[PDB]
Amino acid sequence: ADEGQARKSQLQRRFKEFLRQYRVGTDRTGFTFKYRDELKRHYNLGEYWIEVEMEDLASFDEDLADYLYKQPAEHLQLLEEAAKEVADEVTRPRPSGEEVLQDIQVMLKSDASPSSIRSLKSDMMSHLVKIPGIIIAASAVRAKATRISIQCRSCRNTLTNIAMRPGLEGYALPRKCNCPLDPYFIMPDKCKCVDFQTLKLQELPDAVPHGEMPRHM
């Protein structure tokens, strides 16, 4: 428990030294800081996303790019919280109209051989996978509360800044106000929202074992 945050404050510091130090190019020609420059050039345009590459992360610090393959959930958070502390010491002082620091959605690509939908055995639960396919559907974008704040009903006590977890998982509202049993409601005025879609991915046509209809995810 107390070693949890003490590990994190040592991972969120080694994920920050990766963006801040990784270079490319040789010594004869000349170098190029690959991710500071993209952070700056994407922030100043108003985009807020970098595209980290897994081979680079592996070649810089070999342990991190393994955690990221095994526990991607609780480590993408540290990565996206270091991308926000680096995009702060690079673009500041922001000129006039913006002075609140945005949030950086760290995507990530790779150059590794793809699996297939028929090779998703349950031992791959919560591991980065990489599958090809064909989009078959597309929902309409919706909202998804990220940082939500509630309020009691009778005594009007507030308990704010509550953070939702990402993905498709809800939240369990308390029942112990400290007032009737479940006195808590959501305050619609104070809840930050982000978009979210929901696609449908069909497996490539030349990989069906040819007795049936292709499966999808």
Partner 1 sequence: EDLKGHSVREWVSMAGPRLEIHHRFKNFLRTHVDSHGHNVFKERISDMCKENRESLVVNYEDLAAREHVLAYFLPEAPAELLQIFDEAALEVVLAMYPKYDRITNHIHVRISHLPLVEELRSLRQLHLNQLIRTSGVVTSCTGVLPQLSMVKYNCNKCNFVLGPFCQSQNQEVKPGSCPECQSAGPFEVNMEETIYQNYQRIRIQESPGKVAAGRLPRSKDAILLADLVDSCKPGDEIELTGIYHNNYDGSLNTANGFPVFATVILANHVAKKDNKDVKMITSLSKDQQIGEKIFASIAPSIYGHEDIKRGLALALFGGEPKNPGGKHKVRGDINVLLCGDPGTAKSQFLKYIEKVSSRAIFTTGQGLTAYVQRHPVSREWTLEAGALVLADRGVCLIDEFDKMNDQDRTSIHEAMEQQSISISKAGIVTSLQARCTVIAAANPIGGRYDPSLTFSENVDLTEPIISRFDILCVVRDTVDPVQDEMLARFVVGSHVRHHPSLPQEVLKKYIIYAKERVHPKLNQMDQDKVAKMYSDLRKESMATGSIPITVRHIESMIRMAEAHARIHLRDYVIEDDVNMAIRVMLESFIDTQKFSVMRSMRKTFARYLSF
Tokens representing 212? 């049936």
- Shorter beta-carbon distance to Zn ion: residue 124 or 155: 155
Among positions 121, 135, 156, 189, the unique one binding partner 1 when judged by CB under 8 A: 121
68 with 75: CB under 8 angstroms?
Answer: yes
129 is a contact residue toward Zn ion (CB under 5 A):
no
102-135 burial, b at 16+ Cβ within 10 Å, e below that, comes to eebebeeebeeeeeebeeeeeeeeeeeeeeebee
92 is a contact residue toward partner 1 (CB under 8 A):
no
Least separation in angstroms between residue 159's CB and partner 1 is 14
* Cα distances (angstroms) measured from residue 87 to each of 18, 25, 99: 13, 23, 13
Write the interaction track for partner 1 spanning residues 171-190; mark x where CB under 8 A is met and - where it is not.
-x------------------
Q: Which among Zn ion, partner 1, none contacts residue 180 (Cβ within 5 to 8 A by kind)?
A: none
Secondary structure string (H, E, C) spanning 119-183: HCCHHHCCCCCCCCCEEEEECCCEEEEEEEEEEECCCCCEEEEEECCCCCCCCCCCCCCCCCCCC
151 is a contact residue toward Zn ion (CB under 5 A):
no
Among positions 136, 143, 187, 199, the unique one binding partner 1 when judged by CB under 8 A: 136
- Shorter beta-carbon distance to partner 1: residue 137 or 141: 137
Among positions 65, 101, 128, 179, the unique one binding Zn ion when judged by CB under 5 A: 179
39 with 83: CB under 8 angstroms?
Answer: yes
| Residues 193, 198, 203: CA angle, nearest 5 degrees | 155
Distance CA 161, CA 151 (A): 11
Least separation in angstroms between residue 210's CB and partner 1 is 6
- Shorter beta-carbon distance to Zn ion: residue 177 or 201: 177
- Shorter beta-carbon distance to partner 1: residue 93 or 209: 209
90 is a contact residue toward Zn ion (CB under 5 A):
no
* Cα–chain center distance at 157: 32
- Shorter beta-carbon distance to partner 1: residue 70 or 153: 70
210 is a contact residue toward partner 1 (CB under 8 A):
yes
Residues that bind partner 1 (CB under 8 A): 1, 71, 73-74, 121-123, 125-126, 136-137, 172, 202, 205, 210-215
